[PDB]
Structure 1
Amino acid sequence: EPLESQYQVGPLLGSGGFGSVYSGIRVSDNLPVAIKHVEKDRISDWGELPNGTRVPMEVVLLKKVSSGFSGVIRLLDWFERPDSFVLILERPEPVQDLFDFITERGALQEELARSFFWQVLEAVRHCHNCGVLHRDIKDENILIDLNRGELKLIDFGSGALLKDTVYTDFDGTRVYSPPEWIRYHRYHGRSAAVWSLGILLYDMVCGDIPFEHDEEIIGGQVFFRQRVSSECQHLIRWCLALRPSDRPTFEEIQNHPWMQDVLLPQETAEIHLHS
């Protein structure tokens, strides 16, 4: 009941708009954890979670997805300090983020992209069922447990409760943001999530994101730089429909021909990651 007594802090993993993230270990049982600090002064978005005092929205969102098993990193604990909040979060080991992984290995073979993409889809369907919209789905926000072949979502700090009405606020990653956001500053949750998923799938099979500038995003023309099957190109181009309502639902994505016969996570690691 200090925190620096319960957790042995390790090196800095990185820092940015999410705060500062350290490697740590729960002292009790040697459990690998991640320890993420954010100055209160730097917290744009605030909540109160069914119980009732003042926390960052990020804690409210994490508490909502952290129940039972899933492909999201779970919140294990959190601490209020005078000028900041500290979250204790699961840490896979060994781990690589998907951005790191694609930078080092290049474009993913379709079979591996398919298993990765499938697990992302289950993780997002999980958040949605819990009333949570992530708002920053991207490679770097996807952790690969290298031994188990399991992907995990991180960084709910720009998420929101899911609703059926319009969003007018966004502070996720621009290049994964949809053309209605660029053009109008208006989006709806599921359909904007779906766009960012077409961006990620393109990134997995091509080794880079399709669009860099606003003009490309809103032009929405997809040029393939790598060899990609027709059924994969089709799914991508579906997710990246310029009209939001022309995009697939989660069910349509997961029923797509390209998505059939997905590997299990263990098979995935055995074939593609063990090494």
Structure 2
Amino acid sequence: PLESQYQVGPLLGSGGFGSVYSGIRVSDNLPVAIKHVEKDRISDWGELPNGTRVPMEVVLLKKVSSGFSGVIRLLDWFERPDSFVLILERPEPVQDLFDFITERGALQEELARSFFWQVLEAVRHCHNCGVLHRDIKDENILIDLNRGELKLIDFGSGALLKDTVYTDFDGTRVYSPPEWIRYHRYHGRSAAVWSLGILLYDMVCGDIPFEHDEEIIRGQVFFRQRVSSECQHLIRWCLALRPSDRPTFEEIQNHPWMQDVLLPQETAEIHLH
């Protein structure tokens, strides 16, 4: 079933997310990525319309799979005796945002604006479709270098979006908000906005702002690179200590620092080609 349809290539990487291989769809040569997840490592299960018991990750990906290219598309999946296999699209050439920032150091504001805008559009898309990622960070964002388009990956820490409190969290700690650190409680939207502030700081400073719990709780942001005041203000706003003081997605995208964003294609021509 999986054997003849996909020709398997090298290992792209592995972690809490599982093991992901480069691959090619045999019928039409399409570039793909092939992700294996062991059943024993999955603590979070869900259910399709079908009533079939799958990993929540699969539920979340199917709910967001549509014309929109800001989220990695699930092309197919398969169950095996001890694992699930996911076939995802693979842009070529591609690089993850963590590697891209490591190579360049801090990004120019114009490039950070375009990237961040695209992450925002993509997270809004997820929220629209009832999905909360819960692990927004540079390693979970791929750059299609030709088109200048970003894609969210790794929905393995995600959840159905809801308006009531969350008391579980298995995403990345240094991107998690102070209310989680202190009370093991958070709400979806406001926690997401906090991770987005961490991500934006990361883009423009070349590194995340907080390491330890106490830095997160104190929430004092020091800028290690030259960053415009508008951007500093947006960042500080997203990282407000009280959840209710954080901006909505609308307020972020109406922020003065976010005006006049480049198109993705313009972004590739100026900064990636």
The two structures have a TM-score, normalised by structure 2, of: 0.99
Could you say which residue in structure 2 is the equivalent of 1:225? 224
Following TM superposition, where does structure 1 have runs of at least 4 consecutive aligned residues deviating by more than 6 angstroms?
none
**Distance in 1 of aligned mates of 2:215 and 2:31:** 41
1:89-109 Cα deviation digits (max 9, x unpaired):
111110000000000110000
1:52 offset after TM fit, Å? Answer: 1.3
1:67 offset after TM fit, Å? Answer: 1.9
**Distance in 1 of aligned mates of 2:66 and 2:265:** 23
1:69 offset after TM fit, Å? Answer: 2.1
**Once the two structures are aligned, what percentage of the paired residues are identical?**
100
Kept in 2, the 8 Å contact 1:32–1:92? The answer is yes
Could you say which residue in structure 2 is the equivalent of 1:187? 186
Could you say which residue in structure 1 is the equivalent of 2:72? 73
Secondary structure class of the residue paired with 2:155: coil
1:50 offset after TM fit, Å? Answer: 1.8
1:210 offset after TM fit, Å? Answer: 0.3
**Distance in 2 of aligned mates of 1:69 and 1:121:** 13
Kept in 2, the 8 Å contact 1:142–1:153? The answer is yes
More deviation, 164-173/66-75 = 66-75
**Distance in 2 of aligned mates of 1:175 and 1:237:** 16
Consecutive unaligned residues in structure 2, runs of 5 or more: none
Kept in 2, the 8 Å contact 1:134–1:159? The answer is yes
Secondary structure class of the residue paired with 1:197: helix
**Distance in 2 of aligned mates of 1:51 and 1:63:** 13
**Distance in 1 of aligned mates of 2:18 and 2:48:** 21
1:30 offset after TM fit, Å? Answer: 0.8
1:68 offset after TM fit, Å? Answer: 2.1
Kept in 2, the 8 Å contact 1:178–1:195? The answer is yes
Could you say which residue in structure 2 is the equivalent of 1:27? 26
**Distance in 2 of aligned mates of 1:50 and 1:132:** 16
More deviation, 52-61/188-197 = 52-61
1:51 offset after TM fit, Å? Answer: 2.2
Secondary structure class of the residue paired with 1:157: helix
1:50-97 Cα deviation digits (max 9, x unpaired):
221111010000000012223000100000000100000111110000
Kept in 2, the 8 Å contact 1:97–1:144? The answer is yes
Kept in 2, the 8 Å contact 1:70–1:126? The answer is no
Kept in 2, the 8 Å contact 1:166–1:187? The answer is yes
Report the count of equivalent residues. 273
**Distance in 2 of aligned mates of 1:87 and 1:151:** 20
1:269 offset after TM fit, Å? Answer: 0.3
Consecutive unaligned residues in structure 1, runs of 5 or more: none
Kept in 2, the 8 Å contact 1:147–1:269? The answer is yes
**Distance in 2 of aligned mates of 1:4 and 1:93:** 23
1:49 offset after TM fit, Å? Answer: 1.3
**Distance in 1 of aligned mates of 2:139 and 2:148:** 17
Kept in 2, the 8 Å contact 1:72–1:152? The answer is yes
**Distance in 1 of aligned mates of 2:182 and 2:127:** 25
Secondary structure class of the residue paired with 2:20: strand
**Distance in 2 of aligned mates of 1:112 and 1:271:** 9
Kept in 2, the 8 Å contact 1:95–1:144? The answer is yes
**Distance in 2 of aligned mates of 1:114 and 1:49:** 37
Kept in 2, the 8 Å contact 1:136–1:173? The answer is yes
1:140-198 Cα deviation digits (max 9, x unpaired):
10000001000000000110000000000000000000000000000000000000000
More deviation, 259-268/61-70 = 61-70
Could you say which residue in structure 2 is the equivalent of 1:45? 44
1:4 offset after TM fit, Å? Answer: 1.6
The two structures have a TM-score, normalised by structure 1, of: 0.99
Kept in 2, the 8 Å contact 1:202–1:208? The answer is yes
Report matched runs for 1:56-135 at 5 Å: 56-135=55-134
Could you say which residue in structure 2 is the equivalent of 1:140? 139
